[PDB]
Amino acid sequence: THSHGLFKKLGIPGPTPLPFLGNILSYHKGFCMFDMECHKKYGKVWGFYDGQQPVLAITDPDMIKTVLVKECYSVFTNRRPFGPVGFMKSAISIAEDEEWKRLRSLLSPTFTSGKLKEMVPIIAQYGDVLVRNLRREAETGKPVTLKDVFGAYSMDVITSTSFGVNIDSLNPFFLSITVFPFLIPILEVLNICVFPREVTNFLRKSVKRMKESRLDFLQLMIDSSHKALSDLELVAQSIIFIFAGYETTSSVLSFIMYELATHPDVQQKLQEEIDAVLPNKAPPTYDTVLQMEYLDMVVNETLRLFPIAMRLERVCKKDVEINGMFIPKGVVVMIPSYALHRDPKYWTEPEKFLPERFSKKNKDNIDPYIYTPFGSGPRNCIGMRFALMNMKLALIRVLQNFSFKPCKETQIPLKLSLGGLLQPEKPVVLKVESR
Amino acid sequence: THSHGLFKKLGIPGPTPLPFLGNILSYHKGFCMFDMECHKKYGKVWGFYDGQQPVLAITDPDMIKTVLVKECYSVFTNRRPFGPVGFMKSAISIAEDEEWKRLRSLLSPTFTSGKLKEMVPIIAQYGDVLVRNLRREAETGKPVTLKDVFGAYSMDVITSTSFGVNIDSLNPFFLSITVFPFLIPILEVLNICVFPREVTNFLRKSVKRMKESRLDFLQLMIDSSHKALSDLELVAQSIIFIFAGYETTSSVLSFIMYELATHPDVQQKLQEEIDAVLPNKAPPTYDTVLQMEYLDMVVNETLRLFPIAMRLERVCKKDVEINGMFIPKGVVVMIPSYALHRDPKYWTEPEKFLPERFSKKNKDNIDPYIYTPFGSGPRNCIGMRFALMNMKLALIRVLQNFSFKPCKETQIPLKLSLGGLLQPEKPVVLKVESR
Ligand code: HEM
Ligand code: HEM
Ligand SMILES: CC(C)(C)OC(=O)N[C@H](CS[C@H](Cc1ccccc1)C(=O)NCCc1cccnc1)Cc1c[nH]c2ccccc12
Ligand SMILES: CC(C)(C)OC(=O)N[C@H](CS[C@H](Cc1ccccc1)C(=O)NCCc1cccnc1)Cc1c[nH]c2ccccc12
Secondary structure, eight states: HHHHHHHHHHHOOOOBBTTTTTTTEEEEOOOOHHHHHHHHOOOOOOOETTTTTEEEEOHHHHHHIIIIIITTTOOBBBOOOOOOOOOGGGGGTTOHHHHHHHHHHHHHGSSSSSHHHHHHHHHHHHHHHHHHHHHHHTTTTOOOOOOHHHHHHHHHHHHHTTTTTOOOTOOOOOOHHHGGGGHHHHHHHTOSEEEEEEEEHHHHHHHHHHHHHOOOHHHHHOOOOOOOOOOOHHHHHHHHHHIIIIIIIHHHHHHHHHHHHHHHHHHHHHHHHHHSSTTOOOOOOHHHHHOHHHHHHHHHHHHHHTTTTEEEEEESSEEEEEEEEETTTTTTTEOHHHHHHHTTTTTTSSSOOOGGGGGGTTTSSSSSTOOOOOGGGGOOOOHHHHHHHHHHHHHHHHHHHEEEEEEESSSOOOOOOSSSSSSSSSOOOEEEEEE | GHHHHHHHHOOOOOOOOOOBTTTTTGGGGGEEEEEEHHHHHHHHHEEETTEEEEEEEEEHHHHHHIIIITTTTOOOOOSSSOOOGGGGGSSSSTTHHHHHHHHHHHHGGGGSSSHHHHHHHHHHHHHHHHHHHHHHHHTTEEEEEHHHHHHHHHHHHHHHHHOOOOOOOTOOHHHHHHHHHGGGGHTTTTOOOSSSSTTHHHHHHHHHHHHHHOOOHHHHHHHHHOOOOOHHHHHHHHHHHHHHIIIIHHHHHHHHHHHHHHOOHHHHHHHHHHHHHTTTOOOOHHHTTTHHHHHHHHHHHHHOOOOOOOEEEEEEOOOOETTEEOTTTTTTEEEOHHHHTTTTTTTSSSSSSSSSGSSSTTTTSSSSTTTTTOOOGGGGGGTTTHHHHHHHHHHHHHHTTTTEEEOOSOSSOOOOOSSSSSOSSSEEEEEEEEE
């Protein structure tokens, strides 16, 4: 526990670390309550220790811009190592330094404004499966678990958008990682993997069946100043894209319908805009989705209250002095997204759901280095524009046909998962009525 | 690699161990070819090293009886430690010393001749589901994967026989364990488990739902000179019983139909006996199943060629001198079942399928410490009698309605899985015809 003197040395405040465990006992309320607490206790800058690992929290918008944008390529290029990963080390979210720059370049043109516009005709199909799957549990007044019917939709979208397969989708340990990061190299040599060695084995061969069948995201990889992309590295990117495109889309869509249900005036104000831009229940298109500003305002304000990443992190790969502060090599620099999204020194009534904060009359009084639901700089969420489009296309088709009211078992107020990831404690269950 | 001199010291022959790896590179053809080889090379007794771990192979029937029966309780009480297991350490197949004696006593009366006879009326249902599920893929001349329709049956049997749930069941790393057994205690403290932490979490709560619902194998545990049984220890026994009752029953049943197909004279000789004891396609009963001797002869001879355990093992918990041989504390004593089941110094034409070896005219010329498909002594297969009854009840109802012929894709001869477990390389697929 010799490393527990770094912040005492640097004169940076923070909680006193216990030996070996560091400050991780504080995570007993979740990452987010710990961040919101430390933010209040120490101010703009503090540090703590995930085990022996020093973690410096920064909340200064200038310092955040320095870390995420100005000094990304040079110092803050990678995140805090994750293991064991196995062959998934070559996935873009996990790859480091030059290996990541190459996969970023090769995978970037997948989410152009043009490649997205090609997917709107394809996404529209499963939105109608989503309505019809919802029309069944609606004509029977049985409360609906949203993440089920949303995840069935989100799953349908990601398989075809990246590959082309069409399916009606109705057919405890990481605690030790941070106290035993020295055990990560141990597990890497045992082929153990946080990704099950079966799901990966399924897709590794499934992709090489799809590759040698047509011969989409699967198309653009074999098609492409660097080297070219490999094959086991092609499977790894698909696995990242399939996870994100499913669990992020479904979880946020569930978060949105909970708020639309507990704020019926906003749910009606949005249903009115959807019928105006799309009269006669018109099919949403790429350009109509980009016209609905109150839909974007709802999506944005929901992602303020539930930034599913909670924290942004970068590893300081060498000694730097950013915005007048010395940061030694090896430190993980952390931006507490959840805490800043709820900071009263920037948001009025930050626990209330108020989409009007993002009105064009008010969207200017909002610092983009405080509101970072997708990150910033060269390593932001590569699938941001696709995520916004995917969700918005789902809300339109769903609110065009249904209205949502709370039930007896609806968790009000919603308890967040006091665990790790950002999910609700109890699932989101609402009553669906047909218009 | 200081431990690699033990057998050189004891004057026991065997392959020369490489540093760290021991003799495990020899496993490149499977456990069984290694045993059959070493048996020929060195004779009645040899040793080798799984990593640093000394393993003494014995083939002397007297010495085998000493280890398995005479000296079981005193010296050879447990098998070679298995990890990581987590809460499954309390399962009977895995439990050691006194903890195992208690679970053996508490779980033994589950497989009495009387408790088995109570299950014959219940097993008969899914045998008819098995026929009807087979009548579908038979009236369409589509070759059948036997382990699918057998595993669907074996799964149906084990859930109701132990609990009572009825369902129509149509709705890479252990290599490092033996070079890094010092890593087993490492993994135990990370909650990692060779049993997925999800399947176990499913049944842990599923059982405690069943426990507090009725309030069978599930019945007799809460009902019972020892202490009494726990609850997390109740889930652990269920998991052992469900695995064995599924994968053993299905795999052997597949092995039997492959042989009945490649030896049509035996398949007809057995169909004639089944129709004689059970005329008009009579329903098999507990006592009729025990009357068919040629059915028992087929089952026995199949289990000679494919003893799904391959090896029996016991840990020598203290220095002993058994049958004139010194065996030091810590050594794993191993009986190469597969090798002895194919030893020409005991079997004539041991690669040929010949059920007549087990005729009552010939069943006496067979040493029960050479033919050990279920083990021997106090720690033999506790579910032997149930396994024989379960399989025999399936063969009767299946051969009463169908005959089996090889296909174009039928693997002839059957290659064993050159891996670890005893399975076929390619699945067993045969043509099914309706009588
Ligand atoms: C509501 C939906 C989503 C949210 C809120 C979200 C948020 C984020 C955030 C905060 C980051 C880290 C940014 C940073 O470190 O500065 C990230 C990274 C990433 N996201 Fe998303 N994401 C979403 C959906 C998606 C989707 C649909 C994909 C499709 C593949 C995707 C792919 C990625 C990838 C590949 C990265 C890592 C990129 C890199 O490291 O270069 N995300 N996301
Ligand atoms: C064809 C079917 C089966 C075969 C060939 C088989 C074979 C074996 C063998 C060789 C052993 C080790 C015996 C020894 O070490 O001396 C064993 C142990 C065991 N078997 Fe089976 N088995 C079969 C089916 C079953 C079934 C249906 C069950 C039902 C629960 C079962 C439960 C067990 C248990 C609990 C043990 C460990 C007992 C102890 O350690 O005290 N087996 N089996
Ligand atoms: C330090 C190093 C460079 C090695 O990389 C990281 O250690 N990265 C971690 C990877 S966890 C997760 C792994 C996983 C597990 C099981 C199935 C599939 C994937 C994942 O790869 N997910 C990327 C997809 C995604 C999710 C959410 C939002 N968008 C995109 C954590 C992490 C980095 N960026 C993030 C933005 C948001 C949320 C978590 C992370
Ligand atoms: C040394 C120690 C005392 C600790 O115990 C052992 O290390 N025991 C090993 C356990 S592997 C397997 C584990 C498992 C994994 C995943 C799901 C379910 C179970 C299992 O528990 N299976 C018992 C059921 C069974 C299977 C086959 C035939 N009958 C009964 C190996 C072993 C001991 N006896 C055996 C007879 C036959 C085949 C393997 C073994």
